[PDB]
Amino acid sequence: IVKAGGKEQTFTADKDVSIQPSPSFDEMNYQFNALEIDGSGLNFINNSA
């Protein structure tokens, strides 16, 4: 879930991960792809968002 300003964007591993991790209780790593976030709408307070 990416809250960058006005509306939030939700990216999900079924659509945005190329290689699914193996099922494990130890560690499951979900390496997502390059997710594009619209930054127009960031509220800059003291020149920073």
Binding site: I19, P21, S22, N29, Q31
Partner: protein, 145 residues
Amino acid sequence: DDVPLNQDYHAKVYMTFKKSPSDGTWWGPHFVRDDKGIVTINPKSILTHFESVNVLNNISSEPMDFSGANSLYFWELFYYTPMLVAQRLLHEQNFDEANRWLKYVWSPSGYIVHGQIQNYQWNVRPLLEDTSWNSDPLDSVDPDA
């Protein structure tokens, strides 16, 4: 290598154990790297001995090694220096200041970093992950070894 020996596969990792103590033809992940830096596994490879093999393409660095070349200096910074100071403050009856230097190694109450208690208990990373850094402790009678 900068130039591979085999064009089909740039590196071959395989696994041996008691039942299969031998190299086999395509019996491990054979890694191939493109002109762009993406490393992928050659699909002719047989991955039976492994649960899975995952190439970490976005990772170009590793955490610092508490068993590497400079492991003496890392252990001195994060373990031996707070222990020497807290021992030295304890001898001088400076109890509040001795306490905060022991907590640089171990807080039995935990650690709060920006208003949230942390998951770890031991502030030194090779004490959490029990990281041996002397392979020959019984060469001499050293308690530290």
